Amino acid sequence: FVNQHLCGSHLVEALYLVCGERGGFYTPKT
Amino acid sequence: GIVEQCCTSICSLYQLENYCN
Numbered sequence: 001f002v003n004q005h006l007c008g009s010h011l012v013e014a015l016y017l018v019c020g021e022r023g024g025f026y027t028p029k030t
Numbered sequence: 031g032i033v034e035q036c037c038t039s040i041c042s043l044y045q046l047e048n049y050c051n
Contacts, residue, residue, distance in 0.1 A: 007037035011046065014036065018043075019050035 006014055016025055032049060035041045 001043075003040050005037050005040070011033055011036055015046035015050035018047040 013020065013025065019027070021027065032045055036046060
């Protein structure tokens with residue numbers, strides 16, 4: 001785990017990581 | 031906020047796990 005601040009970008013690929021399939025990033029659109 | 035949370039301070043692995051819709 002990391003104990004830093006995640007902002008505008010990391011945040012997107014943090015939430016979209018949980019929702020970043022099994023080696024994906026996004027789904028519906030591109 | 032809940033997105034600003036993780037940027038202003040440190041957060042968990044559950045909060046944003048529900049903010050990806």
